[PDB]
Design a protein around this ligand. Structure first.
Ligand code: HEM
Ligand code: HEM
Ligand SMILES: C=C(C)/C=C/c1cccc2[nH]cc(C[C@H](NC)C(=O)O)c12
Ligand SMILES: C=C(C)/C=C/c1cccc2[nH]cc(C[C@H](NC)C(=O)O)c12
Lengths: 420, 420
């Protein structure tokens, strides 16, 4: 010690690591561009989206959700896709999940949900009991639960996944009229709901299989691409829908389920192609800052309470993580006002019939569009998870599943009791 | 948003994570006690070591070395064991590795070595090329290299590993006389150099196999134990030894290799038994602070330059990681003075004959004490690692290995060329 040169070298080495992200800590990154392929000048006034053939540079970060920096990328989890676009009007961020539904509806429950998916606070091991307790206490997560224990829970790498903003936004015209919008990116080298499964199994002991897949595909000359599509709803038609489009835990039906809810059609916008990887991972990918509050002229947030909370949360989290510490809108009708005020009532945090209707119809649709083996594998995965928790929690889970569907609960209980 | 309660909840959640340790980021912890079993009053004046049957509470943290928080614990790596003992004279820290040798003896090279074992700075993937360049540029790591690619590289969990302080310390008597000492903990449920291999193969996709093993063993009622032993050298006998005991990259021979270096015998001191696990992992294990500078009356550091650098580095690193940011000694002879001044010369950072003698004798001892299959597996592991690097670096590695033994280099070269 003692030597000033050695002290400087060691002190510089000591201050090299920073806190990881609270969620989505493990991930990879790439650079590409977006190109406009269709005309949307009748619903949009965003400069980035006007003019067929226009190109915009973009940077993308893929991630998992629940575990730490060095965790395996082939786990049962939801995946994230964050896109930063450098337009002439500034930076536009699309922070998407690989599925258009979310776990919860009330933002004040967000930390608890996160704690339900982190390792055990005493042993630092995996703990399904907290997750199943949260599910039994918050029925609006049931829909997502049914999704997570199918094959779709473990099906996607960074190239075969899709991305959905999952919120309703507002697109505004210069005359003041606006529409509710939801856009998403469909993978050009991945499956969909109707057809397609995993085609490249990860190595038995590989924790970075998806990162390796993306890096090797980029080095081989292949360029992954996504097709961007949007769904449009008139503000006066929203209060009359069979579901609430301000509820982030529900999706907008594209033609799969539930059958009694009419389809909201989508239209194409453009295409996103990834070209190259980074030169310095820590400086370019690890320190990337994304926020849903990064918006350009012509796009506004809606009255979604989760989106409103996200507008504040991301800059504050980045202040902790990267800090020095180391056109007027036209008015709608009174009925629209009541429908909007629905989201600030005390019943917003209580379950309704739709919270059970959506998972029931997904469970019914699984054998019609995929087959009996898909449903059987869902039952097997759920039983494998449930057979690790104490008996009273098991009975509570059985009751909740019966609230979803009787045959699903009976099958899960019968298969789970044989595994304990 | 806009609710002060929600803002407080989200802001509190946003600040929970802190930066991980620069090294040894992944690990687990436990609590136990140390008990004295033998009399060492003739060489020691430390309060906690005097009196047969005396008990001292202690807290232990086990860890890996190179990878991040959520990485697998069954990787080819060296393991760490940190023991904090709560004595009547203060806190005494034993910060040990699972092997008594280290990679280097010049502290100014420490960060580079660490960077040679971290993931690729551009792709965040495993990069064998950086490791072999360091070995070809720093021959004093060759010894450790030979250790790392044997079975001992992947043999130990947290219960079957041993611990070595690896440095020379000074134990001082009240009259001013002192001795060079090195103490270590031998596992009571693990293998040794001559006998024993792995008996608990980890699961194919388990990243927390060692933590689970320790937690389950503690829950079953089994208490792991270690036997503490010490080796003693008189200061006037150190300058005449065939090796430098102030070189942390060498070990003190206990009877295995090299045959021409006489044995330095050990004597028993006491026993360490682990009893219980933590209640809050983050508050008790993750925020634990260890330092070799935590010393009690009667024990002093030696003139080891690596130890002198570690005396400063640990409090500074803890200041970054956990900070608000989120008896006179007897004089020796002139010959001892020259021998000590040897460690401050310019030739300290250059290889000597011992740097080649130690790994050569380990390679020769492997078949005599473990069989031919051990040596063959070492060759196979080395070839598997070397076959992923460019050809010029491969030739450099072959030339570097030729300086240890010709047969080892030829066998590795043949296997590696067949593998590519
Ligand atoms: C109340 C709801 C939510 C809150 C409070 C929340 C909070 C956060 C926070 C604190 C981060 C870390 C940001 C950073 O440290 O820089 C993050 C990252 C992220 N979130 Fe959310 N989140 C919520 C829901 C969602 C939703 C609904 C989506 C997608 C539709 C989403 C997708 C993502 C993604 C992809 C990232 C990773 C961004 C990156 O890679 O840099 N989260 N979120
Ligand atoms: C020049 C040489 C070395 C330097 C500069 C160095 C530096 C460090 C640093 C910065 C930490 C992180 C401490 C913290 O963030 O709280 C650490 C941890 C650790 N080091 Fe060293 N190290 C060196 C060599 C060694 C040696 C020779 C050993 C063992 C004989 C060792 C064993 C450990 C262990 C076990 C830990 C983990 C402590 C814990 O779990 O809290 N290191 N070292
Ligand atoms: C895209 C895949 C592979 C799975 C989607 C998926 C799976 C399970 C439930 C789902 N609910 C909604 C979706 C996405 C929806 N499927 C018409 C879409 O492509 O807009 C979905
Ligand atoms: C203790 C195990 C299982 C292996 C030790 C080991 C292995 C390879 C090279 C080694 N060099 C020195 C040791 C440790 C040394 N073996 C007499 C001891 O027990 O003090 C060692």
């Amino acid at each position: 010690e003692n030597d000033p040169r050695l002290l400087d070298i060691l002190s510089r080495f000591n201050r090299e690591k920073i806190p990881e992200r609270a969620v989505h800590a493990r991930g990879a990154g790439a650079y590409g561009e977006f190109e406009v392929t269709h005309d949307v000048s009748d619903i949009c006034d965003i400069d980035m989206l006007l003019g067929i053939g226009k190109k915009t540079p973009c940077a993308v970060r893929f991630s998992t959700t629940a575990l730490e920096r060095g965790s395996a990328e082939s786990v049962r989890d939801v995946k994230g896709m964050a896109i930063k676009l450098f337009t002439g009007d500034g930076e536009w961020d699309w922070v998407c999940l690989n599925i258009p539904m979310f776990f919860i509806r009330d933002p004040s429950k967000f930390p608890d949900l996160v704690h339900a998916q982190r390792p055990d606070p005493a042993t630092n091991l995996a703990n399904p009991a907290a997750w199943w307790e949260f599910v039994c206490n918050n029925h609006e997560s049931l829909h997502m639960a049914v999704f997570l224990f199918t094959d779709f829970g473990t099906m996607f790498d960074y190239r075969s996944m899709s991305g959905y903003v999952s919120h309703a936004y507002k697109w505004v015209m210069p005359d003041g009229t606006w529409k509710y919008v939801h856009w998403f990116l469909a993978s050009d080298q991945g499956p969909n709901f109707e057809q397609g499964n995993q085609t490249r199994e990860a190595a038995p002991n590989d924790s970075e299989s998806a990162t390796r897949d993306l890096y090797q595909s980029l080095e081989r000359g292949e360029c992954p691409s996504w097709t961007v599509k949007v769904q449009v709803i008139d503000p006066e038609d929203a209060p009359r829908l069979a579901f609430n489009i301000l509820d982030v835990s529900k999706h907008w039906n594209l033609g799969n389920y539930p059958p009694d809810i009419p389809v909201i059609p989508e239209r194409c916008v453009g295409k996103l192609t990834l070209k190259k990887g980074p030169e310095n991972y820590f400086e370019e990918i690890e320190k990337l800052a994304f926020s849903p509050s990064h918006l350009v002229h012509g796009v506004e947030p809606s009255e979604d309470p989760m989106l409103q909370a996200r507008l504040f949360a991301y800059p504050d989290a980045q202040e902790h993580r990267l800090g020095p510490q180391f056109v007027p809108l036209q008015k709608q009708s009174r009925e629209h006002a009541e429908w909007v005020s629905q989201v600030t009532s005390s019943s917003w945090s209580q379950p309704n019939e739709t919270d059970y209707k959506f998972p029931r119809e997904l469970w019914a649709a699984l054998p019609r569009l995929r087959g009996e083996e898909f449903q059987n594998r869902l039952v097997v995965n759920m039983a494998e998870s449930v057979s690790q928790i104490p008996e009273d929690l098991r009975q509570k889970v059985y009751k909740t599943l019966a609230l979803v569907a009787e045959d699903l609960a009976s099958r899960v209980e019968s298969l789970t009791e044989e595994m304990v």
